[PDB]
């Protein structure tokens, strides 16, 4: 008789960017999924979406971000591209879920919604959840940065607005990452 | 960051070949490199990547198991090896600088050379 | 693999014309990496639109871009008389592997 707090992260007012994702660690649940099921995608991957209650987990972690709608096919085991090498990287063996909606009417706003950033390039690819959080500038010569010739941001921004089209607006991602330790099941639906 | 192509020379089909480009100033190793070939009166075709640190190269099909790229990453210059050449082997060469530094590689091609000559 | 594009496109100076490249859902349609360069006779290939629709410093304002579907196209408006070069377009294939279209000839 004790529910399990879905909503403070599918309610959140803001995403972290995808460079610098949130992770939230939900245990000691009364786990039901009810409550997070007009979405844009729910696909799942090793995990039963139907019956999701009934097969519960040591530990689940819910992984938040912003992207844009052409973006979103990245955000799965197995491909490659801007955001799953240099952003956010997820496992070959995934056991989880990634949630996502349109979120045009929260964070495109007609002045350009410029408070979400993603990375261009990187020393080197991402480990699955890695993150890098380091916005650094690079120098490719000999030359201080103090930005000038052969110094690179490696941010770049998300240009939202209210005006582009359905794969170039904002999209909220949540996944869903389940596993099992040594540890007994904590996070377990009613019953 | 003037990339100055050498190696290109009329060669009988068969035989190896090896193609390189120098890199103007010190920047050549912040940045991956690329090949592409346009033969004459043709279009473009992608070769190969070679990654700046040197450990992720990448292969068209066409050439794979063939061809051969790598660098030298203290004289600031990109080989090709080339084997067993064909008839069909009649193309300008050039490389290519990525556009971003380090790793990054889906955006394009920035600094092109201006293109080794070679025929069979 | 190989990208289509019509052999040539005509035009004339102040009008604009429109270049397109198609492939698959395999790779023009699945990934929004559409790079477009544009050559000159006897020179080297120059980095014009990435991305779809972004452009490198030093491209004119003129030059845009668009996609829909598994097509991709090059937008060029307000032709100039020294715009007339060959057209590339440059999609990513998947696994690491790009893939040039067959080229466009533009003419004014």
């Known amino acids: 008789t004790n529910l399990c707090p879905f909503h403070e992260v599918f309610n959140a007012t803001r995403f972290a960017s995808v460079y610098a994702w949130n992770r939230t660690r939900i245990s000691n649940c009364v786990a039901d999924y009810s409550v997070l099921y007009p979405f844009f995608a729910f696909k799942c991957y090793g995990v039963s979406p139907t019956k999701l209650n009934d097969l519960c987990f040591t530990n689940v972690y819910a992984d938040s971000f912003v992207i844009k709608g052409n973006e979103v096919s990245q955000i799965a085991p197995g491909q490659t591209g801007n955001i799953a090498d240099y952003n956010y990287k997820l496992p070959d063996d995934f056991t989880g879920c990634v949630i996502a909606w349109n979120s045009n009417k929260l964070d495109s706003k007609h002045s350009g919604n410029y408070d979400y950033w993603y990375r261009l390039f990187r020393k080197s690819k991402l480990k699955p959840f890695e993150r890098d959080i380091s916005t650094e500038i690079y120098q490719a010569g000999n030359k201080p940065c103090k930005k000038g010739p052969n110094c690179y941001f490696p941010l770049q921004s998300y240009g939202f607005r209210p005006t582009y089209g359905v794969g170039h607006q904002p999209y909220r991602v949540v996944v869903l990452s389940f596993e099992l330790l040594h540890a007994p099941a904590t996070v377990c639906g009613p019953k | 960051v003037q990339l100055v192509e050498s190696g290109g020379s009329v060669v009988q089909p068969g035989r190896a070949l090896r193609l390189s480009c120098a890199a103007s100033?010190?920047?050549?190793?912040?940045?991956?490199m690329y090949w592409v070939r346009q033969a004459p009166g043709k279009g473009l075709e992608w070769l190969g990547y070679?990654?700046?640190?040197?450990?992720?190269?990448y292969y068209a099909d066409s050439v794979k198991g063939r061809f051969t790229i790598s660098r030298d990453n203290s004289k600031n210059t990109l080989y090709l090896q080339m084997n067993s050449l064909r008839i069909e082997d009649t193309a300008v060469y050039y490389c290519?600088?990525?556009?971003?530094?380090?790793?990054?590689?889906?955006?394009?091609?920035?600094?092109w050379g201006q293109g080794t000559t070679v025929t069979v | 693999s190989v990208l289509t594009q019509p052999r040539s496109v005509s035009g004339s100076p102040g009008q604009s014309v429109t270049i397109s490249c198609t492939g698959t859902?395999?790779?023009?349609?699945?990934?929004?990496?559409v790079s477009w360069y544009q050559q000159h006779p006897g020179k080297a290939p120059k980095f014009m639109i990435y991305?779809?629709?972004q452009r490198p410093s030093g491209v004119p304002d003129r030059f845009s871009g668009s996609k829909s579907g598994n097509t991709a196209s090059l937008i060029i408006s307000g032709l100039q008389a020294e715009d007339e070069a060959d057209y590339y377009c440059?999609?990513?294939?998947?696994?690491?592997?790009?893939?040039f279209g067959g080229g466009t000839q533009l003419t004014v």
């Open positions: 290519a600088k990525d556009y971003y530094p380090l790793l990054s590689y889906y955006y394009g091609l920035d600094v």
């Open positions: 100033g010190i920047t050549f190793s912040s940045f991956g």
């Open positions: 070679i990654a700046y640190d040197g450990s992720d190269t």
């Open positions: 859902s395999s790779d023009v349609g699945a990934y929004n990496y």
């Open positions: 991305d779809v629709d």
């Open positions: 440059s999609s990513y294939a998947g696994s690491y592997i790009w893939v």
